Amino acid sequence: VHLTPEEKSAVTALWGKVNVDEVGGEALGRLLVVYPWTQRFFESFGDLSTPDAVMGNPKVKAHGKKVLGAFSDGLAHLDNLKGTFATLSELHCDKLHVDPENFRLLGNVLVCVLAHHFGKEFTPPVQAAYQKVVAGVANALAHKYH
Amino acid sequence: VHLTPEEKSAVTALWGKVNVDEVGGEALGRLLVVYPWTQRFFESFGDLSTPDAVMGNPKVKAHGKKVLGAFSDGLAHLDNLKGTFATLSELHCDKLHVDPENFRLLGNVLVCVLAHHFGKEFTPPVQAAYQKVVAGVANALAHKYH
Amino acid sequence: LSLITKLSQEDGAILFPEIDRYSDNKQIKALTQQITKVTVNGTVYKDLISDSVKDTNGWVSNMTGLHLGTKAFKDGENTIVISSKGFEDVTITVTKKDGQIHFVSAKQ
Amino acid sequence: LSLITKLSQEDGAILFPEIDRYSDNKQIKALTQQITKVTVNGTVYKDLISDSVKDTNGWVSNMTGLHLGTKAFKDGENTIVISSKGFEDVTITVTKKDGQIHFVSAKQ
Amino acid sequence: LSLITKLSQEDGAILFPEIDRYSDNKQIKALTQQITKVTVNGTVYKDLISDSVKDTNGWVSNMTGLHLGTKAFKDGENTIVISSKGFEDVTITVTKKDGQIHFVSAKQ
Amino acid sequence: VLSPADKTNVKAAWGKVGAHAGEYGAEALERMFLSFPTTKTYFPHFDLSHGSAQVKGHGKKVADALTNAVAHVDDMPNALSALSDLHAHKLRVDPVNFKLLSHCLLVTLAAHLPAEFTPAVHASLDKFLASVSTVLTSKYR
Amino acid sequence: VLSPADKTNVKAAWGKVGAHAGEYGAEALERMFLSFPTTKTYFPHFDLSHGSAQVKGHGKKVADALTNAVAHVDDMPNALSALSDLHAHKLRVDPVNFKLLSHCLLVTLAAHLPAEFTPAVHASLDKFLASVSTVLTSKYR
Ligand code: HEM
Ligand code: HEM
Ligand code: HEM
Ligand code: HEM
Fold it and tell me: Residue C105's domain spans which residues?
């Protein structure tokens, strides 16, 4: 997924300042809360009954790190998302059976969380960079569905 | 886009029996009627205000053959849709400003039309073949957007 | 016309790149889109929609330009009349010489 | 257990492919998902979530299996005790011999 | 069984709320889902899928519970035998008295 | 909400389904299961084999719920409001799936109704199935 | 429809926008135009450049329409009925675009309201903007 020099630099500069343990958990938190049907996949995480139950559920915060960590390999290999996420595309489709539509949703919630933490720093151009990265990860995880 | 040797035989056997003069125009006609926002792109076609206006409008029938014709390269070159449709992708995104979601819609309407013309012969397996082909074409036209 | 100026030679046919139905020029876009009739040396050509025009009395408007079959092309000077709904017929003039077609003029 | 039978040797760690949190075997899936505590030779290991386990007192459950750091691994016989909310402790036994760990048995 | 405990009366039928095919109790869910055969006082009932059970030899599992037609219900003591591929037949005992059925027992 | 004209088409076309409701219901599920296999996993217990008994059973359940909504067209949200809790609160059905099944119901209706599946009627049915979709996901909103 | 607390969240959070309505409206459009340039083509003659006067103008028009729909949470379809004809019948705006703008509205709201953009409030706003979206495309359905 094709980014300008200024964009690739912009993204990584903002990512470097990101709390990898905190942000992943707020993203998955906010997915499980705003798009309630997503709880189907994570019924094994115990109590997802309230916004607070969900945000303060250790299994969520935990899973958040795996997801956010996986976006980091994504940022490490933007010229090779299709490959970086391959075994993991297999996993989400072949064993979990996640509708790829939800990848786009998580990604967009991730964008809402970055804008929430980075305030005025999450400029329209910075968003447009991150929107390309997040659609890229979504595409890669969707590849081994067809 | 992977089809079983049976799926490929099934697809081509149904396609061989298709009226390449007529079917593209019924698909396009049905898109313009069912999903009225699609009229925006084809205002140069004159009156699309009614189902009669549309199914009697030669610019529609004619455009339908360009679309049906385009699906034919698709069926010829399933190994390389991304490439077969590469130039069309640039056109729809860079020059027509058409959101990729509409490709999935046309393709589903095309599937409704085949089911309308072929009745019981459009078996669930034969659909599942054509649903893979149509998601494939949709993908390739969407590629140059990214 | 300052806009229609050149052409290309293809298998049994010629291409006018600048007769582009997707041209950023609102006027060219609309002309190409509304083409009702083409005559070469008085012969009525057919809209072949998306077929080949190789050795035909046929034209095609597409993303590469206006494609014209060289069936009704004589040796020396040829006269092409393109008509639309909202414009004056464009008359295009070309020269076949030893089976090579060169651009001459396009006037309204 | 007839289900836990082998392991693989990784860089400063061992992998149990059959302790699969995505196993179609509802029993194994649920056990792996609910692992509360892992001990090697009495030493309490930590859930390192998704980091490397290379030369750590750390375990990780992922799509490849249960990953165990070989930090608290002595020469000869070793005893690994996996605890999970639903199920009774699973005791696994393995043998380090000049830097080669081979599987022995796994029991409830 | 301390899980099947009550019932309701409906127009020519009875409802067991707790025989819930969408129950958070994985055991009840699976039992209800896999009901192969139901007998009232020896009479074999039919799966009516989603029709009414009003004065029929018919049962229906849905979101409100297990619905049983009172056609083959005699006065006094009644014996319901629910069979499921999954687990042990569930035997329910109830008492029709002046056209009013009260729950008594449920046992496996 | 549906035009008077839409309702007239839906009543007329669903009328022609008649006693094949259950069979068309069952065909659509089979069409969904083969074409969109992610949908299989909402039915872990079922046999999804072509002539499956459970599929024919669930075909009837769905088709009957639709037959009901075709004569509760003005009363639809209230008619399937219990089904709306079931599908959102318990089954946690992904909105995406309502579009796939709706598509598969159109493919079926088109395949079985050559003589009345006119553009105007396909619009009306497409809308009507989206209405059912909208109600059935409404306890997310 | 919106819960009492959805309404309470939407009224409380939109309240905090206050006199920034125009600016937040304009930011969202600009955020939409950069991230989804397909959207720019609905604005053929508009100056779409950063700081554009027309964008600030159109930002106010939108933000005001939203401020209006807050007061009228209960009868939204009736509140924006004229806007609904305009966007569907005249402009033929592709449904997909209402999700892009809505998303960009949350990014804006989120960016500008650190302390009040709680998960509960993000759900409420997300739903509320989908309501506006649903009404604004309701002459399709
Ligand atoms: C698989 C889906 C589709 C295929 C295969 C397809 C194919 C084509 C082809 C072959 C052309 C003519 C290119 C040329 O002149 O060389 C074309 C033009 C066009 N397509 Fe598509 N198309 C698809 C979907 C859509 C959709 C969904 C829309 C709008 C909602 C759309 C709008 C247009 C428009 C406006 C033109 C130009 C119209 C004109 O010049 O008359 N297409 N498409
Ligand atoms: C960009 C999007 C996503 C990324 C990068 C991502 C990444 C991951 C990763 C790294 C894992 C752990 C796999 C392992 O290491 O063994 C995982 C597991 C999982 N993901 Fe995703 N995921 C994404 C989207 C989604 C979405 C939208 C869902 C929706 C429900 C989902 C559901 C799951 C589930 C259920 C698991 C397994 C749960 C568990 O065992 O704890 N994922 N994902
Ligand atoms: C679009 C129209 C739909 C209708 C009219 C419909 C109707 C129904 C009905 C009547 C039931 C039975 C409820 C009961 O026992 O009381 C049901 C159950 C169910 N529906 Fe839906 N449904 C629809 C869409 C979907 C979709 C798209 C999915 C999944 C992709 C789905 C999955 C289910 C499942 C899993 C059950 C439970 C199966 C079982 O109990 O064995 N439904 N639905
Ligand atoms: C919550 C979503 C939206 C709201 C509240 C909204 C509101 C408005 C309002 C109040 C107007 C002015 C009415 C008038 O001039 O008489 C307007 C005009 C317009 N809107 Fe929207 N709108 C929304 C979404 C969209 C989207 C998503 C698009 C396109 C992607 C769009 C395209 C337009 C266009 C093209 C105009 C005509 C303006 C012009 O070119 O002069 N709107 N909108």
Answer: 1-108
CB contact F35 to A (< 8 Å): no
How far is the C-alpha of G79 from the C-alpha of G69, rounded, in Å?
7
Burial profile C23-58: b = 16 or more Cβ within 10 angstroms, e = fewer: beeeebebbbbbbeebbbeeeebebbbbeebeebbb
Name the amino acid, one letter, at A95: K
The values of phi and psi at residue E88, to 5°, are -60, 135
Chains in contact with F, where contact means 3 or more Cβ–Cβ distances below 8 Å, are A, B, E, G
Chain G, nearest residue to F137 by Cα:
G1
CA distance D18 to D16: 5
Instruction: Compute, in angstroms, the gap from residue F44 CA to the centroid of ligand 3.
Output: 13
How many helices (H) and strands (E) in chain D?
1, 10
Nearest one of C47, C103, C45 to C70, comparing CA atoms:
C45
Inter-residue contact C69 to C13 (CB < 8 Å): yes
The answer to whether the CB of E7 falls within 8 A of the CB of E15 is yes
- List CB contacts (< 8 A) between F106 and chain B: 112
Phi/psi at D39 (nearest 5 deg)?
A: -120, 135
Q: Which of C80-97 are b and which e, b meaning 16 or more Cβ less than 10 Å from the residue's Cβ? A: bbbebeebeebebebebe
Token digits for A57?
Answer: 């559920």
Any bridge partners for residue E61, and if so which? E66
Q: 3-state DSSP helix/strand/coil percent for chain E, to nearest 5?
A: 5, 45, 45
The phi, psi pair for E74, rounded to 5°, reads -90, 175
Neighbours of chain G (3+ CB pairs under 8 A): A, B, F
Strands D58-62 and D46-47, bridge-based pairing: parallel
Q: CA B58, CA B46: separation in Å to the nearest integer?
A: 10
Residue of B nearest to G88 (CA): B37
CA distance F81 to F88: 11
Q: In this structure, what are the phi and psi dihedrals at residue F8, rounded to the nearest 5 degrees?
A: -60, -45
- Smallest-distance ligand from the CA of C61: 1
Pair B138, B107: CB distance under 8 Å: yes
Q: Inform me whether the C-beta atom of residue G58 falls under 8 Å from chain A C-beta atoms.
A: no
Per residue, the 3-state secondary structure of D1-18, as one string, reads CCCCCCCEEECCEEEECC
Six-digit token pair at D6?
Answer: 């082998």
Which mutation among B20, B23, B31, B66 tests ligand 1's pocket best, with the greatest number of atoms within 8 A of CB?
B66
Which residues of chain A have a CB within 8 Å of the CB of D34?
44
Helix (H), strand (E) at residue C10? strand C8-10
Q: How far is the CA of G74 from the centre of ligand 3 (A)?
A: 30
> Looking at the 3D structure of chain D, how many domains does it have?
1
The single-letter code of the amino acid at A124 is: P
Q: Please calculate the CA angle C32-C33-C36 and round it to the nearest 5 degrees.
A: 80
Distance of CA D42 to the CA centre of its chain: 14
Distance of CA F137 to the CA centre of its chain: 13
Dihedral sign from CA coordinates of A98, A101, A107, A110: negative
Let me know: does A34 contact G122? Beta carbons within 8 Å.
yes
The gap from C-alpha A100 to its chain's centroid, in whole angstroms, comes to 13
* Burial profile G33-59: b = 16 or more Cβ within 10 angstroms, e = fewer: bbbbebbeebeeebebeeebeebbebb
Nearest CA of chain F to the CA of G138: how many Å? 8
Experimental method for this entry? X-ray
Question: C-alpha F93: how far from its chain's center?
Answer: 14
Ligand nearest to the CA of F136: 3
